[PDB]
Ligand binder design. Structure first.
Ligand SMILES: [Mg+2]
Ligand SMILES: [Mg+2]
Ligand SMILES: [Mg+2]
Ligand SMILES: [Mg+2]
Ligand SMILES: [Mg+2]
Ligand SMILES: [Mg+2]
Ligand SMILES: [Mg+2]
Ligand SMILES: [Mg+2]
Ligand SMILES: [Mg+2]
Ligand SMILES: [Mg+2]
Ligand SMILES: [Mg+2]
Ligand SMILES: [Mg+2]
Ligand SMILES: [Mg+2]
Ligand SMILES: [Mg+2]
Ligand SMILES: [Mg+2]
Ligand SMILES: [Mg+2]
Ligand SMILES: [Mg+2]
Ligand SMILES: [Mg+2]
Ligand SMILES: [Mg+2]
Ligand SMILES: [Mg+2]
Ligand SMILES: [Mg+2]
Ligand SMILES: [Mg+2]
Ligand SMILES: [Mg+2]
Ligand SMILES: [Mg+2]
Ligand SMILES: [Mg+2]
Ligand SMILES: [Mg+2]
Ligand SMILES: [Mg+2]
Ligand SMILES: [Mg+2]
Ligand SMILES: [Mg+2]
Ligand SMILES: [Mg+2]
Ligand SMILES: [Mg+2]
Ligand SMILES: [Mg+2]
Ligand SMILES: [Mg+2]
Ligand SMILES: [Mg+2]
Ligand SMILES: [Zn+2]
Lengths: 95, 64, 31, 87, 272, 117
RNA sequence: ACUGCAGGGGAGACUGGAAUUCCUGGUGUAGCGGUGGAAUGCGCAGAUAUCAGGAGGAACACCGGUGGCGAAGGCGGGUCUCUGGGCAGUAACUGACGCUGAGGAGCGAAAGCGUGGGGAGCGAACAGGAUUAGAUACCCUGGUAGUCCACGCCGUAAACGGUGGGUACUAGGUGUGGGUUUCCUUCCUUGGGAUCCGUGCCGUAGCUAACGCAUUAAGUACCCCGCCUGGGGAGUACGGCC
């Protein structure tokens, strides 16, 4: 039960409407074990500063969970192993 | 004279790439304390922010 | 000239190690 | 490690009177708790030498404290030894 | 994981053995066992075609599922981890939730009681069998088939693994534990993970009799043969063989792969 | 028969040599006349004179294939770093954009032992 | 104990980019490389160069410092997980429980050793080239161990501040790092002062053979330990332990 800020860089090939349920199907496993989500903000398409995974564009997502370390590690696992993500960056907002 | 020492509750996060635009040279080099006028802890914070921005591609690793 | 004091020790140690390497076998391992 | 609400639950059980936190017994109790958790930390991470040295520092501290209590009064020594675990 | 006997006897001086710490249920599953008899290296003609075989402990064959084709979507539980005399890897008894009993090669990190998925939607965990299409590039895999539906044939001995190198159009490029880079069809399926028991290569068999137990029969050097028996034979004292080293059949050492074999198109870079 | 009006001059000025290559913007070399190509050998290929003949030769050979307009990517800690680009200027190319592309290792490969000369 | 605080302190997992090397292809031709000057060497079978992709290993530019942390050895790409110490403040608690420490135990750069991996670059040995009277070298071309990883072993370094630990006191001046606290307090200045803990420089008394040390002492004292008794022989022999 600790704060976590997660930025995820998704492929620009998928659309702006199907991004939210595609992330709900990941965050529900975070929800099943007591962890909750505060803000699932989506910055959308954005040009990224150096070529990443054969894409020069990327969808920015900020996840902002409050969850156990095991659950956040599992979430990072799952969304890093999916084919719809180019980057993941997990941090803690708390001290 | 350090900007963040003067101005409070401005947490340094790699998300604020707009603020991180400065403290970075046009080449992409992290500026030194003698050129940013800022303290050791805030220079640590901005350096960490710049590096995480680089690894999330919010800031260039190499640029001209 | 304090390095001279180191050079004498160096030469003595070097010759001793050279002797041991001349005899790391039944030349000395038996004894 | 050993947050406030985690140390209180053995401060009541090992310290003397509702506010005792520096007595021999209290110090043995939370040093023992620290050594237990850090020995778990060292059963994982076999080669964290800088933390294992901290463990030996705590062990030495607790040894001085147990000899202190055994000299000052021996019945309390017996009770604390039975209710923590020695040898 | 390797336990060394003490030098209580000259046959056990440097010998070692697996501690068998991963094994549960030292007996095999009865319905899944079929008979097996030694051959002594003899083919259908009754003649020795592989030298140095014979004797050795009696063995029973357990059926390993190198297919894993027919239970996509139905989950399995690793019921047991068990000895198998027939391979250097350990085997995992899986209970499928539909009630089917199965043996698979035991990967690293499939302790008894955890869940194995199969098919395109399986999670990328050790033991899950997926098509190379659904397996991402860079991960360590094993028991990978050469042809779609032909069964696992690649990296299935203890400690072996392919890493998936890439998938460009319809072929997965992958590094074979010989170090060889090969392309196979992306619909060839593999199970994620290294093969377990990776430390059995460190076993020092202490004595001749132990290899005799494992079925290897003494090998005689060609240079102590007579010329009638071996090209290296002959000579008054001991020689080096009076010629460049050749097999007992006079074949010089050198590449023996068919230079015009049909699989050269898929072989990208031969081993180093 | 390959005709392209715009190009890039990659210049590599190492302590021993200078190599001038003329490529298309896509990065396909057409002309490459270097300091050994212009008659030189040994330590004389390090000199700015060799630099400003190699660049001239590359420039003329690239004009033979039809480049008016070049942009320069210079690299290397050599003395033929300016003589070369003025040679391309005065051999008929227009200098366009000038950059610096000397590789800067982020403390990667361990360098060779320092010369005890 | 509580509240705060700074930090490359440590361990594990995952992960990022530059650069070097190699491979595949595109272009393209006769050089490249290297030196004080060359040659060995690489290339003409397509090298060097240049573009794209890919493999892999190692180290983590700018931040970066004179700085920080660690008992010392040492420690920095990033993230997460676990974890040690330190500093300040309150005075809540114990009430001398302290200091040192023969032996002993642990930690202990690099090299080295064992087993198993890995191996880009570098590079003992080695080989060739060069230089030279010779050149078992310095320089060049290659290049094995090793350097890296896991786990053990080794237990040594100019392991140095060539300065054992603890404590008290004895002008200051000036930086820098981490806290706390009072005055123009909203004149913001994030100035001035006090105090605690570092860390540097300069300097008084004092000390010193002199060099210099000098509140971080090599000063003034006390406690405990280690060590020396001319240079070699020799940190060697013998014995013993590892
Ligand atoms: Mg901070
Ligand atoms: Mg003198
Ligand atoms: Mg017959
Ligand atoms: Mg045989
Ligand atoms: Mg005979
Ligand atoms: Mg016969
Ligand atoms: Mg014959
Ligand atoms: Mg014979
Ligand atoms: Mg003979
Ligand atoms: Mg740390
Ligand atoms: Mg690259
Ligand atoms: Mg290679
Ligand atoms: Mg080529
Ligand atoms: Mg090339
Ligand atoms: Mg009292
Ligand atoms: Mg001692
Ligand atoms: Mg040790
Ligand atoms: Mg080493
Ligand atoms: Mg080794
Ligand atoms: Mg050796
Ligand atoms: Mg090895
Ligand atoms: Mg050399
Ligand atoms: Mg030589
Ligand atoms: Mg490790
Ligand atoms: Mg010593
Ligand atoms: Mg040192
Ligand atoms: Mg000494
Ligand atoms: Mg003292
Ligand atoms: Mg001070
Ligand atoms: Mg002074
Ligand atoms: Mg003195
Ligand atoms: Mg004497
Ligand atoms: Mg001795
Ligand atoms: Mg002896
Ligand atoms: Zn500041």
């Amino acid at each position: 039960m600790r704060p976590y800020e997660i930025m995820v860089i998704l492929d620009p090939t998928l659309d702006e409407r199907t991004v939210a349920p595609s992330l709900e199907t990941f965050l529900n496993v975070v929800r099943k074990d007591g962890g909750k989500v505060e803000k699932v903000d989506i910055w959308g398409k954005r040009r990224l500063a150096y070529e990443i995974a054969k894409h020069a564009e990327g969808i920015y997502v900020v996840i902002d969970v409050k969850a156990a370390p095991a659950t956040v590690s599992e979430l990072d696992r799952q969304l890093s192993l999916n084919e719809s993500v180019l980057r993941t960056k997990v941090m803690r907002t708390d001290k | 004279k350090c900007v963040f020492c003067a101005k409070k509750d401005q947490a340094i996060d790699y998300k604020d790439t707009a603020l991180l635009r400065t403290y970075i040279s046009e080449r992409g080099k992290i500026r030194a304390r003698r050129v940013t006028g800022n303290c050791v802890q805030h220079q640590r914070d901005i350096a960490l922010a710049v590096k995480n921005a680089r690894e999330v591609a919010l800031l260039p690793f190499t640029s001209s | 000239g304090s390095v001279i004091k180191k050079r004498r020790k160096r030469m003595s140690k070097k010759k001793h190690r050279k002797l041991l390497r001349r005899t790391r076998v039944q030349r000395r391992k038996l004894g | 490690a050993l947050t406030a609400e985690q140390k209180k639950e053995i401060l009541r059980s090992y310290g003397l009177h509702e506010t005792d936190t520096g007595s021999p017994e209290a110090q043995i109790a939370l040093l023992t708790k620290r050594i237990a958790d850090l020995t778990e930390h060292l059963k994982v991470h076999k080669h964290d030498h800088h933390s294992r040295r901290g463990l030996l520092l705590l062990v030495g501290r607790r040894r001085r404290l147990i000899k202190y209590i055994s000299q000052i009064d021996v019945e309390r020594y017996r009770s604390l030894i039975e209710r923590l675990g020695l040898r | 994981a390797i336990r060394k006997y003490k030098p209580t006897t000259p046959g056990r001086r440097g010998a070692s053995v697996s501690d068998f710490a991963e094994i549960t249920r030292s007996t095999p599953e009865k319905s899944l066992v079929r008979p097996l008899h030694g051959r002594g290296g003899r083919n259908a003609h009754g003649r020795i075609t592989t030298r140095h075989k014979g004797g050795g402990h009696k063995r029973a064959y357990r059926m390993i599922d190198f297919r894993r084709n027919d239970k996509d979507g139905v989950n399995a539980k690793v019921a047991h981890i068990e000895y198998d005399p027939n391979r250097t890897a350990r085997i995992a008894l899986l209970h499928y939730l539909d009630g089917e009993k199965r043996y698979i090669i035991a990967p690293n990190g499939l302790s008894q009681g955890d869940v194995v998925e199969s098919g395109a939607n399986a999670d990328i965990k050790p033991g899950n069998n997926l098509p190379l299409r659904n397996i991402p590039a860079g991960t360590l895999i094993h028991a990978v088939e050469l042809r779609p539906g032909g069964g696992a044939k690649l990296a299935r001995s203890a400690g072996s693994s392919i890493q998936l190198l890439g998938k460009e159009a319809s072929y997965a490029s992958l590094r074979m534990p010989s170090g060889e880079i090969r392309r196979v069809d992306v619909r060839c399926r593999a199970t994620v993970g290294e093969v377990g028991n990776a430390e059995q290569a460190n076993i020092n068999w202490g004595k001749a009799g132990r290899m005799r137990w494992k079925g290897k029969r003494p090998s005689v050097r060609g240079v102590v043969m007579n010329p009638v028996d071996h090209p290296h034979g002959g000579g008054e004292g001991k020689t080096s063989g009076g010629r460049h080293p050749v097999s007992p059949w006079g074949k010089p050492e050198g590449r023996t792969r068919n230079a015009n074999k049909s699989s050269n198109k898929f072989i990208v870079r031969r081993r180093r | 028969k390959k005709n392209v009006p715009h190009g890039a001059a990659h210049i590599k000025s190492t302590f021993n040599n200078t190599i001038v290559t003329i490529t298309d913007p896509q990065g396909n070399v057409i002309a490459w006349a270097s300091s050994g190509h212009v008659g030189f050998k040994g330590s004389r290929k390090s000199t700015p004179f060799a630099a400003q003949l190699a660049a001239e030769n590359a420039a003329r050979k690239a004009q033979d294939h039809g480049v008016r307009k070049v942009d320069v990517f210079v690299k290397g800690p050599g003395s033929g770093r300016e003589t070369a680009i003025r040679s391309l200027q005065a051999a008929g190319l227009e200098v366009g954009a000038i950059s610096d592309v000397t590789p800067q290792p982020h403390n990667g490969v361990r360098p060779p032992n320092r010369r005890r000369v």
